[PDB]
């Protein structure tokens, strides 16, 4: 019975409470405008509760509170991402930083990638809804190619300096590349920003659209045969699924990174409930 362990126990259970609430927001076909808003609240609550836990874990380290051998056996179940015969104080510190780096440099990375790509695909879906106003039938089908390319080109522009990672500032090539491999070379692309690098959104799906439109020819508005229209729309709809699957990929990488962080808490919570 120690106040620091009790306050830690309760803070960790409040984390597992937020983790579950975030798993709900992440399992929905549509990540609406509100979905990102909810994801932000839970993330900010996790961040400040992890900060409180660290401050509590710090107390336990400097005071060298014992971690019984019956409890050190449970820290083996901690995910290998946590990086867990060492001193009592060194192990409490080896946790406060573990739980803190699992959030800043691991969990929150997937969070921003999701939001960055969610915003991008949200704005693209607006181009999708506005296609009704750029396609007129007469078979015959008139297409406002210029208006559509301008829309897609300004989508690329609006997100050139909004990378999947990092959220702020830059990182090293070996750091941008190491995260590119985890997210996917098809969803992102390392890019130079000022002196360092980032993991920018990969806009190849939109680039492919612009190439297909340039191939339709014409000098502005283009009238297609019925077969030439179903052909274009098929490739334009296939690129839509590519981005929709790219986003589903990030969501799973995020919810899985949450399940890991959650088990790092489940293990920790059971490690203090004993000691």
């Amino acid at each position, epitope marked *: 019975p120690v106040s620091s362990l009790t306050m830690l126990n309760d803070t960790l259970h409040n984390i597992r409470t937020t983790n579950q609430a975030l798993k709900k927001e992440l399992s929905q076909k549509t990540l609406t*405008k509100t979905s*990102l808003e909810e994801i932000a609240l839970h993330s900010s609550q996790i961040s400040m509760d992890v900060n409180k836990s660290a401050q509590l874990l710090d107390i336990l380290s400097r005071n060298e509170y014992p971690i019984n051998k019956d409890a050190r056996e449970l820290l083996h179940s901690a995910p290998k991402e946590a990086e867990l015969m060492i001193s009592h104080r060194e192990l409490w510190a080896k946790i406060a930083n573990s739980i803190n780096d699992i959030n800043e440099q691991y969990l929150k990375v997937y969070e921003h990638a999701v939001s960055s790509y969610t915003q991008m695909y*949200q*704005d693209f879906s*607006a181009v999708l809804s*506005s296609l009704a*106003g750029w396609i007129s039938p007469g078979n015959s089908v008139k297409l406002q190619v210029n208006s559509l390319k301008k829309a897609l080109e*300004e989508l690329k522009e609006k997100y050139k300096d909004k990378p999947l990672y990092p959220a702020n500032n830059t990182v090293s090539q070996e750091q941008a590349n190491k995260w590119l491999t985890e997210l996917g070379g098809t969803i992102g692309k390392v890019s130079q920003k000022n002196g360092g690098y980032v993991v920018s959104i990969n806009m190849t799906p939109i680039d492919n659209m612009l190439k297909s439109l340039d191939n339709l020819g014409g000098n502005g508005e283009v009238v297609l045969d019925n077969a030439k229209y179903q052909a274009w729309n098929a490739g334009f709809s296939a690129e839509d699924e590519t981005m929709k699957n790219n986003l589903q990929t990030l969501v799973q990488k995020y919810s899985n990174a949450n399940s890991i962080f959650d088990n790092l808490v489940k293990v920790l919570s059971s490690t203090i409930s004993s000691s």
Partner: nanobody
Amino acid sequence: QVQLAESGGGLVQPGGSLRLSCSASGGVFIIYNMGWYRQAPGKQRELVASIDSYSGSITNYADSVKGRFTISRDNVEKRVYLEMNNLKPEDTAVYYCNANLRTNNYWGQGTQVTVS
């Protein structure tokens, strides 16, 4: 070039509400960030609501307006809306609608909104 035209103004009593509407015609409506402005007699122009291009997820309002106005956009029909609830006398002004993207800016003539 984009042509803007606002409609829906008029006289209301304090606590009343309006449905301000701006219809656009011309360029690519979807790429422009929209924003409603107002200028009361004598006083200086003011930004009241703003919405970004495309889906329009990002919106912020002036402190004197939050919770009462709401800005939305219809890319399909190419119109910008500003529903105004619980209107106060200080909300009296000519409300203009702005389409903006980098240095590109387009304006409608604006509607009068009087609350008394």
